[PDB]
Structure formats: C-alpha cells, structure tokens
A paper describes a structure:
MpPA14 ([name] [name] domain) lectin is a domain of a 1.5-MDa adhesin responsible for a symbiotic bacterium-diatom interaction in Antarctica. Bioinformatic analyses indicated the presence of an ∼20-kDa domain near the C terminus of MpIBP that is a member of the [name] family, which is a carbohydrate-binding lectin module widely distributed across several kingdoms of life. [name] domains share a β-sandwich fold and the presence of two consecutive aspartate residues in a cis peptide linkage (DcisD). The DcisD motif coordinates a Ca2+ ion that is directly involved in binding polar vicinal hydroxyl groups of various carbohydrates.
Glucose, GlcNAc, and other glucopyranose-containing carbohydrates, including 2-deoxy-glucose, methyl-α-glucose, and two disaccharides (sucrose and trehalose), all bound to the Mp-[name]-Ca1 via their trans vicinal 3,4-diols (ionic bond length, 2.5 Å) in gauche configuration with a dihedral angle of ∼60°.
Residue numbers in the entry: 10 to 191
The structure:
C-alpha cells in the first residue's frame, strides 16, 4: 500500500561526482536507493549556500518538508531531488515560472513543461504555456539538483496567463491521485 498525503513522493540523492545536466541526475537516481525519502508538500525550497548535500543544508532547503525525512543523509558534494505524484488542475492553460540553482525538469502527463538542462546561478525563468484538457489530478514529476554552491528551487504555476502565480503545496498535491484529507 502507498502512503496517501497532500504532497509529492520525494527522493533525495547525493553523489561525489559532478552533476552537469538532467541526464546526470537521472543516472544518479537510477544508480541506487534514495539517500532519503520525504513528503514534498510545499515545493518552495532554499535559498542556501555551501552545497545542498553538505551538513544540514538539505534540511534547511526543504524547510517544513524536512520533518518527513526518512534519514539525515551524510555529506556529498552534489545532490538533488526527484519528486513524483499528482497535482489537481482544472482544464485550461498554465505556465510555470521557476527560480532555481542549478537546473531542473518538470513533466506533466508525460510531457516536459519546464526545463533547464544545465547548471546555473540563481535565475528565474518564465516558461511557455501548456494546456490541461480535462480537470482532475494530473501526473507530475520533478527533477532538481545542485552541483555545488548555492541552491534554490521554487517552481510556481500560473492559471491566469502569468498575472498571478502559486506554489504547488498541500492545497492541490496528492501522492497517489486520491483526494487527501490530512
Ligand atoms: O555554474 C553554476 C554555479 O554557479 C555559481 O558557482 C553558483 C552555484 O550555485 C552554481 O551551481
Ligand atoms: Ca533509485
Ligand atoms: Ca546531512
Ligand atoms: Ca477523459
Ligand atoms: Ca559538483
Ligand atoms: Ca549550485
């Protein structure tokens, strides 16, 4: 049975090799069991300095969500997160606006909707719009990583053409696609 909570299923992975792009982080995910799991219920992380994978920086980055960590990982030079689950969205047009260091990829219903396939200092990107054809829980996954240095990850979403944006949080996230009452 899978835990039902108002969030995405989160996995953290650290490494002492360099993460340069999405494929490097995906290879890390596929190489081993997660160094820690957590519930990603408020997806607005960072900003911090001196490497996400060192010391208590992951805890600081994840903020409130860190109370659901399965373990406190040891030190690594590089690290990142893989999130997967569901997000309630009505039919319509949407776009992400993401502040991040380093890169990331967000996919909904199997289609990339926000991608930065490289390392970067903290930048905000307003991504192109996409459509949701039918209201309900949509499948979503996210990758983000830190190659070292500073780290931040805040992928906000707009339903009104970029006039207002919201964080993905427990109001609309579901780990399994069933309605959470938590
Ligand atoms: O090259 C990207 C790198 O630029 C700067 O060193 C700040 C870092 O956080 C970032 O990872
Ligand atoms: Ca794995
Ligand atoms: Ca630690
Ligand atoms: Ca249908
Ligand atoms: Ca590195
Ligand atoms: Ca960084």
């Amino acid at each position: 049975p899978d835990s039902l909570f108002a969030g995405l299923v989160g996995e953290y992975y650290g490494t002492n090799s360099q993460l340069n792009n999405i494929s490097d982080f995906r290879a890390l995910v596929d190489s081993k069991e997660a160094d820690a799991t957590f519930e990603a219920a408020n997806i607005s992380y960072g900003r911090g300095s001196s490497d996400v994978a060192k010391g208590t920086h992951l805890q600081e980055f994840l903020g409130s969500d860190a109370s659901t960590l399965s373990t406190d990982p040891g030190d690594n030079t590089d690290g990142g997160i893989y999130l997967q689950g569901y997000v309630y969205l009505e039919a319509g047009t949407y776009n992400f606006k993401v502040t991040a260091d380093d890169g990331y990829e967000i996919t909904i219903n199997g289609n990339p909707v926000a991608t930065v396939d490289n390392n970067q200092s903290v930048y905000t990107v307003t991504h192109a719009s996409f459509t949701i054809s039918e209201s309900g829980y949509q499948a979503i996954d996210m990758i983000w990583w830190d190659q070292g240095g500073d780290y931040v990850f805040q992928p906000t979403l707009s339903a009104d053409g970029g006039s207002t944006y919201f964080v993905l949080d427990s109001a609309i996230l579901s780990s399994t696609g069933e309605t959470p009452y938590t």
